[model samples]
Target chain A: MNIKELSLHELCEELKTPAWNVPLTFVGDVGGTSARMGFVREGKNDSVHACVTRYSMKRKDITELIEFFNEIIELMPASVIKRVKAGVINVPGPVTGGAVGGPFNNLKGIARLSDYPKALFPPGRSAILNDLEAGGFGVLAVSDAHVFSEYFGVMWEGTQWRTCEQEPAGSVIGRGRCLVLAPGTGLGSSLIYYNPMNQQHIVVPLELGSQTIPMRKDIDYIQTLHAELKLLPNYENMVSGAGLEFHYRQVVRGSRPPCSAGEIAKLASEGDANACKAMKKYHEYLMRVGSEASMALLPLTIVLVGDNIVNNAFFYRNPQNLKEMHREALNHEMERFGFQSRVTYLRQKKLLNLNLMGCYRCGLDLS
Target chain B: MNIKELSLHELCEELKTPAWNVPLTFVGDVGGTSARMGFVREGKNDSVHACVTRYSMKRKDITELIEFFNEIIELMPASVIKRVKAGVINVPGPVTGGAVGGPFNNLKGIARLSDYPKALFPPGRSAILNDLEAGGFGVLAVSDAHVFSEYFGVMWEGTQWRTCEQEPAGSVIGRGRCLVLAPGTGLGSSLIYYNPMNQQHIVVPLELGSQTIPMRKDIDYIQTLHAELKLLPNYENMVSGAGLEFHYRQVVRGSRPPCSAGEIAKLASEGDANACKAMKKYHEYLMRVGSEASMALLPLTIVLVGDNIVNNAFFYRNPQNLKEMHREALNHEMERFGFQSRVTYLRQKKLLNLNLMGCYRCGLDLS
Candidate 1:
């Protein structure tokens, strides 16, 4: 944690080991809530698979973390561990100067990669990046209409959606320039840049979630409804899973304990009034914030991911209806400003091992 | 315009000429109001100088453009023209599929590079990009505190000012990420990404001006004050030079014709009640829109350039007072959202040939 001899880039270059005979790599997604580690390798047909182990733990000291990582590595097969040559860790905040610690991130002291044992990550072949950035690359790692359809079910555009084969070839949203809005543990957002000529891309992570909500009468009315919402600092506060709980508690108005986002969803289906109201408020917050960002970004496609989106299918299950609601708000804003553009909304079916996959791809760049 | 066989990158590769002995480049900045062309070359101390020609003309056909460029090249000294081995043309709006034509740009039909003669730009070495993107590179092309000091006088941060040498070395801001907001004929914006490791950077042009203003009582109040404001399409209508005219006309309220932005400034200095009101409103619009953007972008440094900012030193002249106003509003927003980032504002004195210089630097990338 105290090793500050070099920036993140410098450390990577200095520690880069020579190319290994094997192509296996180590990848991890370290968020505020938990840590997931895995080893990944590419197979036939450009497919990548991972052997991952997820463990949830509170934030801990670096000394304990080092031991924790070592223990996890030991659980892996000897053959797999030996083959791993590159590694990447995706954290929950901006990775500035190769050090991870931001107001939004809990892993404040995990600044240097050198503190880890050499065995955990091969020299010069490991890196750390923002989780949203990892998610951005993960989008490209699995850039296909069929893959998306398999996970997301159908593709939504304008007033209609089509099956996997019915979508555009190669890319699910044509090619290039899409925005990823992941309303998960935090409101994660990133812009994906695709170079059509080479079919390559670069992801620019954004801190849109950190921005305050723009003042509006409707927004104000919502804020007044909930005590937690009234104390909100940024959009993430009202858009994440915790936000769902706040919405329910605000209206339920009782000493009853809060329910999990999953529990609330189940309850809503069973005609629980408070749960249903919470779900509606959750969707409102998501769409309002989502459309506001999309207005500025002007992305050709908007990819909505994360637990709140994927697990609940609040948008995916009724994409056409969601589209109309989103467009109605977006177009109204657009018209007031005298501009508008057609944007396609994509809802991923499952919160797959995207960050892990992205970290794995980063590992491939080590050589 | 009809030649759709090749994309921009492919066309550049096919037309790339062999290496030339001379190290000179041709650059052009084509905008809605005018076109500027120049020949540039690097001199001692990594300094670049250009011999430029500017002409104002309405949008015209491509056949006329080819001849227009040829005539401009002929105007240059024979030795200089012959030595130019590369080129870049910066146009307004996004350059998608290697073609320039968007809602913002005027050069729609002038898409294909083949439409021009080889004499204007060397084969395979010339390219085109959005004007705002060029300005982003221009920010880096002269990434010197001294140069900025010369062009922009003093640097304003928080509530103080510093001379050129007193500022940080190399960059006007510390280094790396900064946002460029240029409000000229339109509201042009770009994000400048500086890779500290290599001291290199890339400019990502943005269409932030196209975003609708979020609903707020204050914003709504301003909209009601003017007839033109009532019909505002987007932020550019209220944040650019034309925005000033609308502000002036709103309160001036008569059959009198509109005054030029410069004329309005002069009138304000003379204590014309209506003009003074307009300038105040103009600054209000600028600060509101700017702070709104800065919150979302989270840029370390905010560079305000172009005619509107440079011509009227409203923020630069009384920076401490202006800073107080900006801070008060920004802090209020931040406090409400539970986020804050201290940003330094840089005001360049003149709208130097940034797009042209940026184009020149880009031409150097031609191998």
Candidate 2:
């Protein structure tokens, strides 16, 4: 039975049966570089069956992607697909209003994708959320215990303003009340605040990665890069992934042997002293950016997510954790203020296929 | 004829008469170096009949000061003095909770000699307001028309936060959300916000002068002053009258010509290039202190008052104008998102006497 061909009403009927009682939902993790789409159907025990795929975010046409989604729906029986009720999308950047605009404009095309909802087994409402926010929500959904320990007697009794009683697994500190950070194709930040009086959560999206002063007094590499690239005054030019590459090139410039990103990573992994030092310097810049971001946003909790966090070896090496290194650097930077902070790391794998579920929970009338 | 001989009840009754119906009150202007005291009767109009004497703020006692106050009251008939009700004191420093705790400590003595009511006038019931605030308020009372025209614009007609809805006069902008700064014996700053919501005013007294980091960062003048003279870290060391002497001595150590504050003024006045340069530098430091104070308060209107404002030629005569010099020196010190500002001057004679009136007005208990 091809579920993709079933009517919405027919799918709803199938959703009531014990054999196929699970609701079907569509989810998308949209980012600057790529968009990851997935489908999930609930089981008899309220379990979820999900399948996902990645598509180039920059290229706008999503006709084939919709077809691919239809193919995944066909894998399930027609009757089961008809019961899906919700679709959720997690964009790599901030989920501002309904449109996602950030360093990576990869999902810009999907926002305009027609017939994508029509192809779902059961017609459902769709919604979008910031990737980091979605990731944080998803982690809270799965964790049985409080996410954060009550250190320094700071209690998290989950009030309306204090949504997650547990501390966030990872922290994203930037300019504002609460912090949302994406370190992927580029860096992105959002400040979140809940006005108790208004009962509204205000997310002030900021392009902090792009706001750093170009010629920082402490960092010599930034100044060297500024001269070499003849770059304009912008934080993005010296702190993003491209910025990292620019710094690496400057360090190896005029050397007997130059190196590429992959080569440097390989050499550093093999314990080459020069490569290690260069990578350490690169990390120092990242740490500085992070520290500045933290100072800008004195948030109660910080949420960090995106491809770089999950895929970058330097950030999450098995033995020497990049998160720990970054945390130590942050502590050192905050020494003047006598601030002691804790950071939690949420592996990307734990939040798989939860974006669509979040959409349903958010009550968007996408249909 | 002696006013002190009249009972408080009899004085209250006599104040109700038409011929003698004066706003009977007491006023005090407390500064780092000196303090001024006066009394106002209803028929006296804006003038104080008794002599206004200057006393070294440190050596003066409030009890003795009140005896002097009684002598001033003695000049007036007993019937006229019996009508007095309220009192106000304009302190050169920020008034915290109606308690003047900084350079001036004789408030307790003044409270005692007044024979003030304990309920309405407790030991600390004196309406202690910053001297700059009193000056600003006094200016508002007198030049309500001309000052507004000089500092107002069309957009300023209903601007809630403006001090006066007029175009600012000269280099001193005294119209919108003005920050009153007085470098008399010491630096003092107060923010006057015209609340649109209530159509009233809010005066935010700032301890900026006391919080300033010393001009010479490495020398540790604050520490030295603390060790040598037991001085507190405040505007007294760098921007006040005595501060000028300290700065001059520090700069011109062992010069054949002993440099006095007056001599420096004479040299700057006579077009002595080095003396002029020294005065210019001193003015620049003064402007720096002003800018720092203004930045700390985020006031739109910056009104420079006190003897230094009118007496010190270098502050206004420099080609750049002290305001422009402040902008050049301190604009970059602010956060990128902070407010831009301008400065203005107010004559001591015109503003000082009215502030003295404010002290008298505040001291009265009309109700």
Candidate 3:
């Protein structure tokens, strides 16, 4: 048989086993703009070694992902490829087993691992996870203190919200059950709860961006806001990147041309009145959605992430103001729904790489 | 030593073991209205036998519950009481281990099982569960077909919604992940998922009644309604028994005076215009909230229970109309949030006694 004619699975069958004691697992994080792939394993130095390579995607399709898989396999050393027994791909969509579904953009019509070479990811041993879920699993790999400290660094230090002192002095947020929300292209949420019975953390990913935000006639801006934008009254309409743009456009009333969420944030930092107002509304709505989520899970701490939040931390630079705003939003809902639990609010640094690390850890579990 | 001086714990220690093979477990289901206590064991007929006794709660406090516990122990067969080593109490409030918390009325200021005799429940061997969680565990005791058949009997048969035929015949609802919502005095929700890896059903209880519903100005009645009742804009305010009263009162404008939710439904069936309008709005809001929950959990089936839904099943007698209304509410959300999953809607027959059976099964696990 010609070597070139052999399939990836057949070639793997042809290769003999090596004397390496540790097994190798392939891990891939496929996002809208780029894809990252690597092999992860416990090294002799007693640490997880995850060396990944990044490549941009032009089409951002299943075929692109398949080709990237092939490329990563070809780049792998012969010794490592022979020992590849398990693998996982973290996609930016809802995943059941390894199947990715629509309503989520980018990858469409992809089912299970039927499109991939069978030998690459052994059926029962491999799986796919929603990127948000991967971030949730990522929580298990990092320390609560690190996340807490980082959150405090962004939203609490030198901020007016805490200095007002509604709470007793030396009050610290508890780290037990956690709810993680990321408002980037859209709003994504996942809850991390440590189950004492099983001695493990269970990450429940939720598709709540689609959760319709109930509008009240009492709220003056909501009526006029919906009139021009005609936006669906959901969390994503007011709490995401696109949502921020909507707020900005509403504030400008077509006087200014359209701009990205990032641009609006920049303008706000530069003391643009309309941009500042837009950011303020965005901050208010973001806090409202976060408070809504807190009502359900009652997590000890809420960790906020995503580019829209981290890049514009200045909007929440005043802890006292942010605290009151969050409180007002929560209390508003509390009166309506009757929630009594007080939860701590914190922000996750975008540089934390929770998604990538979580994917790596999941791959290790598969092996 | 006087026998009266010996505590329940000390008394249990004094009893000797019997040679009988099957062990007996103590299970109690304590609701806001009544309390049921039972002894369950594997019978010789190869069936689980749960013989329970019911009693009303005059005070509805922890002390009353403790008194009931003692009364039950005093009445137990000497042989059974001696063998009872494990027990579980299902309370209507939120439970952490065996501790019950407030926001849940009736049982206030109770912490864990510290209030109970240590020997009675056996520390670490038994625990308390929120009534909703117990009902979730109850799902495991019953078959999917039984629940599905009962649900269809109430909502699908002879309904205008299904007669419309939006879906093909023989299109049965899938049974995988289940979201259970009970709208009675309040709106309670729980999600149940079968974990394939562990072969166990994980039930997650949520406090979503406090979730604030966004109001829209275009919805003309909401402003006036809020002004009259000053009720919180939450699912509970619109989907629960009290919420129904709010709608009915809004319609009558205080001309008919006050009436319970039941009374309002009764009037609606008698063809009262205002009553029918109130019920119509109630059904619309219930379906809306259920659809909103569907967007998040994306459960294969949604199980609706509680007195309000079950007793008011006639309102949904038109399958074709119900289906359209449900579809309309869901599509309204879909356009906003982007959910692609089609979920089956089902209702639990209140007489299924899931809560009692679940408490029994949970007690069995303890032993």
On TM-score, the leading prediction is 3
What CAPRI class is candidate 2? incorrect
Per-prediction TM-score of chain B?
A: 0.78, 0.68, 0.79
Candidate scoring better on DockQ of 2 and 3: 3
lDDT head-to-head 1 vs 2, winner:
1
Ranking by DockQ: 3, 1, 2
* Residue A45 alpha-carbon offset, candidate 2, angstroms: 41
- Once fitted onto the true fold, the runs of candidate 2 whose alpha carbons sit more than 4 angstroms away are A1-367, B1-19, B32-34, B41-58, B61-78, B103-126, B142-175, B214-236, B250-253, B257-263, B313-351, B360-367
Candidate 1 chain A least-lDDT 10 residues: A1-10
Model 3 chain A: lowest-lDDT 10 consecutive positions: A1-10
For each candidate, the DockQ is 0.29, 0.03, 0.41
Predicted structure 1: clash tally: 13
TM-score of each: 0.78, 0.44, 0.82
Q: Choose 2 or 3, whichever is better by TM-score.
A: 3
Q: Candidate 2 on B1-367: residue-level lDDT in tens?
A: 0122233344344444564555455566666456665445543434343224455545454444444445446554666555445556665433323432223322333333235332223343356566765766554544442443332221111112233334334323343456566766556665555422123444444444543232333235455554555433344455554555555555566563557666666776777655655565455555555545443333445566655555663446454554455453344323242322333433343223546754543453223
- lDDT, model 3, position A50: 56
**Chain A TM-score, prediction 3:** 0.79
